[PDB]
DNA sequence: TGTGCTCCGGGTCGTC
DNA sequence: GACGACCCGGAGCACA
DNA sequence: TGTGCTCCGGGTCGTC
DNA sequence: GACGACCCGGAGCACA
C-alpha cells in the first residue's frame, strides 16, 4: 500500500516495500529552519524483491522540490542488517527510535517526522451582496481555485488528515503570536514548525516570514485544498443580525442628514452617498450595555472593507496588552467620532473599491475628560469618569442636535470651537474614546460609495 | 581487460567494461593540493551487461584510501546517453575533453588522470666494508623490504610504467629545488604534483611537505618498489677510486701521526683510532688541477657519514648561488682545516654508529689573504690571490712539518700563535678556505673510529 | 574601426 | 562530492 | 559521600 | 547530504 519511490529506478514495479505486521518501513522526513535557509527532506524504504527474498535501503533526499541525491545499498538475503542501516539513519536524523516512532518528537535541528497518505438564498438581496462585500467571496473563490491546480502544493505527496491537523496547530501558533502582534523571534519559532510540518517548495528562495493576515487566509485555503448555503453560514458565525431599511424611514432619513451635515469640511476630497442602511443587532450586547450612564451618542466609527468581518464577529476590541501604542493618541480603547468623514477617513477606499463601511453605534460616554493634549495614559486620569473626549478645532453644535431611540445623534453643521493647544497638535475634530465595550452599542452599519474629486 | 570496481556491488562479474576500438571507457582521477588538506580521487567508469545491451555509469570518489560515495547511474539500452554523462563527468571534473584526453594537461584545482595498470665480490674486503657504510645497506634493504610488504603503496591499483615515470619527472621537480635548497612555495607547487601522479594514503592527516633528503630516499624505494655484484656497480657510480693502504706503510705512518699530532687540545671529549686508510684518485681531477700554485698543503676535511656519497660522486662542491650564507664565515666556497679534530667534529658521529670519515686532500693555496675577523664576502678582497685563510689562536708550526708528495703536512702539536681578534669573534684554529674546486686534489680518504670520554 | 543586445557557458557560491 | 542559483564576461550579431 | 580511570557515544567539525 | 577525526563529558567502575 506504501509506494516504492518512483525516483528508484532500478526496483520499481519490480519490488514492494517490505511491512512486518503493523510496522511498514517507509517513512518521509522533513525540516525547515528559515535561520539557516534550510528546506529539506529525508526519505527512508526498505525494500524486498517480489521474486527473491533479495533486501535493501533505498534513500532519498535533498532540497523540497529537488530529487536530489539517492542511496541504494544492497543487503542480500540478511534481513536482519536491511533494519539495522533502516533503523540507524532513522536516529541519524531524527534522534527518536524507530521502535518508539509512535511517541515521536521533533528535534531542533534535526528532521520532523510526516505520515503521508498512501492511497438556495435565505437572505435579502441587499444583506446578500453585504457579506459578499464582507468575506472577499470573488477572491475566496477565485484563489481556492488556484489551489485545486497548483501542483507544487504537495511536493511530498498527498499528506493525512492527522498530518493536516498538525498543520492547523502550527498555523495556529502563528495566528496566535501575530493575533498577539509579537515578532520578537516567535515568528520564527513557530513558522518553521509548519513549513516543516507542512512541506513547501520555495525552489532555492530562502522562505517568508508569514505576517499579514492575508498570508493567513492563503494557507487556511492550502490546508482546506488538502483535505446552508454558503453565504448564509457565513451570517449565522457573526452573530450578528443585519437587516435592510427603507430609504424613507425616519432613521435613513436622520442617518442620510447626519452622515452628510456631519462630513468635515477640511476632508475635501470626497463625497458619499448612502448605497444601503442596515440594523445592527449583537448577540449579548444589549444585555451588557452601561445604559446607567448619561451622556449617550449615536458616533461613527470606520475601518478598512477588509476588517469588518472580525468587528462584527468579535466585536469593537481594544489593541492587545502587546501595546503598538502608536497612533493611540489616549492610550488602548475603542474610538469613535462625531464627524463622518473623519471615520471614512479610515476606510482606506481606492477609485476601483470605492465603498467602505461606517459604524454608528450608541456610546455611553458619562462624563467626559477633556483634553486638549494627547495622554496615552489617559484611561489613568479619568479619576472617576467614564470616557475621554479629545476636543477639536470644529465640532457639531448642540443647537442643532436630534435624538434617536435615546442616544443623541449630533447633526451638523460643525462650527468652530476656539478650541487651540499651545503645546503641540490641535485636534482637527472630536475624538470620543471609551475603554470598555459595555458602553458600546452596536446599532447601525452604513453601506457608503465615495466618490472621488481627482480623477488620477 | 580493466576490471569493474569491486566496489560496485550490483554489477560485480555480471557484467563488463564496455569498450569500443582503441578507447576504453574506465578511468582513474586524483588531485592533492596540500595547500587546501585536498587528497581526492574520483574514478568513471561505463558498463554493459554481460547478458543484455544494458548499459549504466558508474562513479565511485572520495579521499585516497577510504571507498567514499559512489553513483550508479541506469541508461538502459541509450547507450549515446552513457558516453555523455561518462564524458561529461570526466570533462567536469579534468577540464579535458574526453576525444582528446590523450593530449592531457592537468588544471590547478581540477583532476590529474592517471594511467593504471589492469594486469661475487670484486672488491677487498675493506673496500667493501666501507661502501657498506657510505651507502647504509643494511638500511636501504631492510626499508626495500618494508615497501615490498606495505600495502597501502598503491591505494588506487597498480601504476604503469609511463605512470611512474611521472613519478620520477615531479619527484625530481622536488629533488632540483631542494637541491636548490629554496621551499619558497615551490615545494608546494611541485610536491603537490608527486603526491598526484603518485596516490598516497594519509588517511585524513595533511599529507607531509618532503624536504629532507632521507625522505627523497623512501621515495625513489617507493617508485622502485613500484617496477655486477650491488656493492660493486656502487662502487663504479662514484668514479672514484679507493685503495686500502698498509697500517705500516708510509702514508699510515705520516697520516696517523698527522690526525694524532694535529687534534686539538680543547677538542678533548674524544679521541681517534684510525681504523683503516684508503687512497683517493678521483676522475678529471689530476688533468684539472691548478698544480702551479704555490703553499700546496695536504689538509683536513670531515662531513657526516650521510654525505660521502656526493661528495665522492661529484667531488667537493660549493654551496649554490642561493646562498645559505649563515656559518660560511668567509663566503661560499671549500673548508679546509690543518686539524684533525677540527674537521672530525663536522662528522657529527654518535656514540652507537662511532666511525666517521675525514678527508685529506691536496690544496693550492697560493697566496694566502690572512683575517682575524671574518667577511662572507671574502672571495672578492683576494685583489690577485688565490685562497684565504682564518687565522687561529692555535695553529701547527712550520718547525714540525713534512712533505709527502709535494704536499706540505703540517704536523703538530699546535701551539698559541698570539693571535687575537679585538673586535669580535677569535677563532680557535685555521681555516683554509679555497674558492674553485680545480685547487683541490682529493688524495686520501681516512676511515676513523671515535671514542667518547663521556659515558652517557 | 564600435555599441547594443541577447545567448551561452564557465566560476563561484550556496544548500544537501 | 552532487546539484542548482547567481554573477558576469565573451561570442556572435544587428544596427548605424 | 569521592577520585582515577577507561570506554562509549554524541556533537561538532573537516573533507568529498 | 556522506563519512571520518576529533573533542569531551558522562556512565560505569576499581580503589582507597
Known amino acids: 500500500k ?3 519511490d518512483p525516483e528508484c529506478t532500478a526496483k520499481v514495479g519490480k519490488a514492494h516495500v517490505y511491512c512486518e505486521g503493523n510496522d511498514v518501513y517507509d517513512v518521509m522526513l522533513n525540516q525547515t529552519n528559515l535561520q539557516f535557509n534550510n528546506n529539506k527532506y529525508y ?54 527510535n524507530w521502535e518508539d516512532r509512535e511517541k515521536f518528537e521533533k528535534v531542533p535541528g534535526k528532521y520532523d517526522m510526516l505520515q503521508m497518505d498512501y492511497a438556495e438564498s435565505q437572505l435579502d438581496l441587499r444583506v446578500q451582496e453585504l457579506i459578499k462585500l464582507i468575506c472577499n467571496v470573488q477572491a475566496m473563490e477565485e484563489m481556492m481555485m488556484e489551489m485545486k491546480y497548483n501542483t507544487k502544493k504537495a511536493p511530498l505527496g498527498k499528506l493525512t488528515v492527522a498530518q493536516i491537523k498538525a498543520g492547523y496547530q502550527s498555523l495556529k501558533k502563528i495566528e496566535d503570536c501575530i493575533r498577539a502582534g509579537q515578532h520578537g523571534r516567535a515568528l520564527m519559532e513557530a513558522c518553521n514548525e509548519f513549513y516543516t510540518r507542512i512541506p513547501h517548495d520555495f525552489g532555492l528562495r530562502t522562505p517568508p516570514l508569514i505576517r499579514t493576515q492575508k498570508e ?8 482546506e485544498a488538502l483535505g446552508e448555503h454558503p453565504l448564509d453560514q ?44 442596515f440594523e445592527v443587532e449583537k448577540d449579548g450586547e444589549k444585555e451588557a450595555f452601561r445604559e446607567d450612564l448619561h451622556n449617550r451618542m449615536l458616533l461613527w466609527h470606520g475601518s478598512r472593507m477588509s476588517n469588518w468581518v472580525g468587528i462584527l464577529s468579535h466585536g469593537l476590541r481594544i489593541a492587545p496588552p502587546e501595546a503598538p501604542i502608536t497612533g493611540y493618541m489616549f492610550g488602548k480603547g475603542i474610538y469613535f467620532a462625531d464627524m463622518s468623514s473623519k471615520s471614512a477617513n479610515y476606510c482606506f477606499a481606492s477609485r476601483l473599491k470605492n465603498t467602505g463601511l461606517l459604524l454608528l453605534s450608541e456610546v455611553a460616554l458619562g462624563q467626559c475628560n477633556e483634553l486638549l493634549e494627547a495622554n496615552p495614559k489617559a484611561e489613568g486620569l479619568l ?27 449630533p447633526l451638523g453643521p460643525a462650527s468652530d470651537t476656539g478650541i487651540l493647544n499651545p503645546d503641540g497638535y490641535t485636534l482637527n475634530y472630536n475624538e470620543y474614546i471609551v475603554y470598555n465595550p459595555n458602553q458600546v452599542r452596536m446599532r447601525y452599519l452604513l453601506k457608503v460609495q465615495f466618490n472621488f474629486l481627482q480623477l488620477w
Chains 1, 2 share one sequence.
Open 2 to 4: 506504501a509506494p516504492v
Open 43 to 96: 526519505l527512508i524504504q526498505l525494500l524486498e524483491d517480489d521474486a527473491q527474498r533479495n533486501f535493501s535501503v533505498w534513500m532519498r533526499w535533498g532540497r523540497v522540490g529537488k530529487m536530489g541525491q539517492h542511496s541504494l545499498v544492497a543487503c542480500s538475503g540478511n534481513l536482519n542488517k536491511a533494519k539495522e542501516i533502516f533503523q540507524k539513519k532513522f536516529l541519524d536524523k531524527t534522534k527518536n
Open 216 to 223: 493567513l487566509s492563503e494557507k487556511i485555503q492550502l490546508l
Open 234 to 277: 457565513h451570517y449565522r458565525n457573526l452573530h450578528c443580525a443585519l437587516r435592510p431599511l427603507d430609504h424613507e424611514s425616519y432613521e435613513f432619513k436622520v442617518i442620510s442628514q447626519y452622515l452628510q451635515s456631519t462630513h468635515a469640511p477640511t476632508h475635501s476630497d470626497y463625497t458619499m452617498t448612502l448605497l444601503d442602511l
Open 383 to 409: 479619576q472617576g469618569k467614564h470616557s475621554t473626549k479629545g476636543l477639536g478645532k470644529m465640532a457639531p453644535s448642540s443647537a442643532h442636535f436630534v435624538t434617536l431611540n435615546g442616544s443623541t445623534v
